[PDB]
Design a protein that fits this description.
This is part of a larger assembly, with 3 copies of chain A.
Chain A lengths: L4 E9 L3 E8 L6 E7 L5 H16 L8 E6 L3 E7 L6 H7 L5 H20 L2 E2 L8 E3 L8 E3 L6 E2 L19 H4 L7 H16 L9 H9 L15 H10 L10 H4 L3 H4 L1 H4 L6 H17 L14 H18 L3 H7 E8 L8 E2 L2 H13 L4 E12 L4 E13 L5 E15 L2 E11 L5
Parallel strand pairs in A: 10-15
Antiparallel strand pairs in A: 1-2, 2-3, 3-5, 4-5, 6-9, 7-8, 10-11, 12-13, 13-14, 14-15
């Protein structure tokens, strides 16, 4: 690399890569060099970087970050990209003093031009999102450039296939969420989501619960609420509708969208009114997006439960209570007669019926006179139909041991519930960890 | 990958040791010219220390100034690496000053002028030293009038024009600049703050910022809290004080640069501005300063932190002691008075889980000769109404057999003053459970 | 073995806790007269704490003076023991003073007179309190003009006539007498030294002896190193200073006694000798004194000792660091330079034996990335040419698998300056060996 180019300031650094401003001394250029410490690159990471470079070499377009050169050294591979200085498109928009549909249409025109180029070269990006929409420079009219093909796939013409569950939740297409084979149209759905945001500054599908979010997407459950959408042109709403078409076979393509009046006749179709409420809302959208930027896998418990999920928690705690109090009548009321169970007491066997559990009621659960305190930690409830549910939780038990010393033990427990004859009943459970009897 | 050094040099005694290097006196055999050879096993060189080595060599290659320890050659010998430097034989500037019979502002100005010239040369080449201190201010030789030389660029960095950036928290506490202490992006001005500290010492023999509590020291530095106490400063020219003030400027954007300082009347018109009065009190104090610095010189890493606790920190210790007392006495009322109702806790009794509330702890009060010792408590004040304390909890007790025993746990407790009362909102115990 | 207390008393809230006792407010049912009941499980009572209980009861039975918390009954209830005391409701004297709008020498003299009268009564009964301090100087009630009362005889001892003897190292550091600090036999005069400390505080609001380093404090006390700084003391009558000097007399045989102090002009002729000028600066300072004392009040045992090390102590740290550096660098020459040839050592590598000389250690230099941390070093200066240091040696290293690891050992090193050089004559390592 130093052979021809010259390195300068650092623009970023990942796990195996460091990026710096560069210059081709022979030609007075200026690029972004992705310096990869090949000694840190794993095998599966090696497979993905080979794919990203091959794809980037294949895409030569103004609105696509261009890969200019690839060269290796002593355990150090260099990838020379375009130098992009303008940052995120969405961040630039909030800084503008004027912003209208015409501005949004000019943006989406460029994004569609890049998507169309990708599709024409048999490439699907699969992760169109604001973070991957950059401005070439801070110049007043810099070009929008599509970036980061780390999730991009190579497709065979117009053949659909299941390439895996990948993308960013808020932009995933219905076909991917349905687990159907998919292809180029997934990018056009994402474009429709981006176009929606560019007009009013908030997403068309949003929900704290990801499961609910995905239900909304699969149902195409978006609308154009007043007042903000009252001033949006019909043609812009029309283009969104054609992109956010649930059935990918009927979804507008990149080539077709480039011919939509709102795109190719912007001068006469797109409004030129200022949308301050879109700028104000985009500011909040961007701020939330930068706060939720998870650098690492973060797993947060559940704490805002529907009434249906609380019902499962309640009957579960009623069952645990009956066990602690040695009330076999309540236990057989709440448990299904055909209950099965994996539990440490059963030594890796699947036990069926009430017999195995009757032994601990008829003896220990009431015979032993010592204080015990049960704690249920981080319950998670799956609703799997109107009359079925699953609950998973940690069961912490404080108790007094033989020497009269306080002890604690932990179990992990799954309980499957079926509403039969109007009553939630436990048909199967699985305990791992410690056995519930001290 | 050559063999120049071994086939053209001769090695002698060691002069100093580095993190990954050894410095030895050497001689170029053909000429009998002696140098200081910095040697490294290319084996040692990890990706980090190899990048550091490359950086030091690249930086030192650029620096060719009379008042800088010059690099003469860089050789990779297929198994080792050798950086050939000037051999400095004059010792430290500060040691030389105390031995003089006459020392005045004019002498100090001459010293600072050479130091600024070395710093100015670095900055003009886009290089920031970051570790200006007496140990790096050497005399080229024992000859009277020898030149001051700037040494040791192991912490030096390269900057791009006048662009600031975070290059890491590096330097020596007494000479660190406010911008580094604030975690701001920084650049060339950090060296000029250090020069201000050095100039202050060269005039009176003691530093402008000093405190046994490093946190207080850094807050003094960030506030620019220095002054010119009488009587020693009453005899100092106003122009000397003026130059110091322009160096010890909190805002690096308003701080005097190396070039500007070299134009200051006290420097470039030294014969007219600088006093030639001998300053015996400065020589005396400097001898103490050097003796203290030599005792505290960085040898091995040493940790010791239980200073004269402030009243605010003692308050956190007291409420923590009151809490543990309530536990040992099994007084749950006092426990729920001191602990926030939304208390969270990691502890061995909870088996890796984060527990919330009072329930988990009530079990031990309701069901379960003790001497508790709190060892080496450390308190962070995190606002007027917040603090955390960290201590070793060493408990002596009698076991079931009637035998004495000791258990240890390490505890963190976070405190928030709510409704006028210090309350424990979170704690983390590691080690042994608190119950026998 | 009776049942008087339970059949004739009624118990209420707790007022304080003791090592083996609980103090509760109580009432004699027939009369409605309230008292403070000190209760003990006769179970707790070990041979020691049973002898202490017997001692406190026997001593308190003797003391019947208006300015002493009187004992009214001692009952053993076949399972418990109850000491019935006066109920004191006035709080501490020092807290009351800060709340007054007028306070002068005359007020202080009146306070000290009652304190001396209580102490005089003890001494005349062959009893030494040994723990005179503000916490034990209470007001009988909240009524204006209430009597000062001496409380808490848990550290009190019995003496035989005027015979001195070693009764143990007991008391509160700021009020300990030189003779106890010297480990001399002692007696009644220890209470009079404490009275001098209390009187000094009553006049200006701060103690005569104070230092964060307890060792320095004790050397101040043993030297009698106090003074009367201006301006606060310029307005104090010479007779007040005179009485203080006669109490803070290093030699207990020349110290003024309680009886003699009660005859001092500033006491018995208070109306003529003591100034009636209000001393607002004393009230202000006392408020600080009380606040500080309340923060540091003995709750649980707390250990924290890494003060602003002296130059002499830093020298021991430095030479210890240099020694460990030589070990880590495998430099046996430097090791035999620093270690005495007759070095002895306990260490895990020696399997419980005491090894002597250099041979045992040469093996590890001759045959066998390191970061050594020295944690919480403590230095005892044991003469101008001797010291010992004790520290935790925490070593980070890479193992055979290329994985980072940490080991801990605890080390003692004894140093003797021989021929002008600090040399290590003995060391003791516990915990891990120093080799991976």
């Amino acid at each position: 690399f130093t052979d021809e180019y010259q390195l300068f300031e650092e623009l970023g650094k990942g796990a195996f890569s460091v990026v710096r401003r560069c210059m081709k001394i022979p030609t007075g250029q200026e690029y972004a060099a992705k310096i990869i410490n090949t000694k840190k690159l794993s095998a599966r990471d090696h497979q993905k970087l080979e794919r990203e470079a091959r794809i980037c070499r294949l895409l030569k377009h103004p609105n696509i970050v261009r890969l200019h050169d690839s060269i290796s050294e002593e355990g150090f591979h260099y990838l020379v990209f375009d130098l992009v200085t303008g940052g995120e498109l969405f961040e630039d928009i909030v800084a503008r003093e004027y912003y209208s549909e015409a501005d949004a249409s000019h943006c989406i025109q460029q994004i569609l031009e890049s998507v169309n180029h990708c599709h024409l070269n048999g490439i699907v990006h699969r992760d169109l999102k604001p973070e991957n929409l950059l401005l070439a420079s801070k110049s007043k009219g810099a070009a929008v450039k599509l970036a980061d093909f780390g999730l991009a796939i190579e497709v065979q013409g117009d053949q659909q296939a299941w390439f895996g569950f990948a993308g960013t939740p808020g932009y995933l297409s219905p076909e991917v969420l349905r687990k159907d084979p998919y292809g180029k149209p997934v990018d056009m759905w994402a474009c429709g989501v981006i176009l929606y945001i560019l007009l009013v500054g908030y997403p068309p599908f949003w929900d704290e619960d990801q499961h609910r979010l995905y239900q909304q997407i699969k149902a195409g459950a978006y609308d154009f609420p007043s007042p903000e959408w009252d001033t949006v042109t019909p043609e812009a709403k029309d283009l969104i509708n054609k992109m956010l078409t649930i059935n990918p076979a009927k979804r507008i393509t990149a080539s077709e969208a480039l011919k939509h009046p709102w795109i190719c006749q912007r001068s006469t179709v797109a409004s030129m009114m200022h949308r301050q409420e879109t700028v104000d809302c985009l500011k909040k959208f961007n701020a939330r997006r930068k706060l939720k930027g998870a650098i690492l896998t973060t797993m947060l418990a559940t704490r805002n439960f529907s009434a249906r999920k609380q019902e499962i928690i309640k009957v579960t705690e009623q069952l645990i209570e009956a066990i602690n109090n040695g009330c076999f009548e309540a236990y057989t009321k709440i448990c299904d007669p055909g209950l099965t169970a994996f539990e440490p007491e059963a030594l890796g066997n699947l036990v069926e019926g009430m017999d195995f559990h009757r032994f601990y009621f008829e003896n220990a659960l009431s015979k032993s006179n010592k204080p015990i305190h049960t704690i249920i930690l981080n319950p998670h409830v799956h609703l799997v139909g109107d009359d079925a549910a699953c609950i998973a939780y940690i069961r912490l038990t404080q108790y007094m041991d033989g020497s009269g010393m306080p002890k604690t033990m932990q179990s992990e427990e799954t309980r499957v519930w079926h509403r039969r004859d109007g009553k939630w009943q436990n048909v199967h459970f699985h305990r791992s960890g410690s056995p519930t009897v001290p």
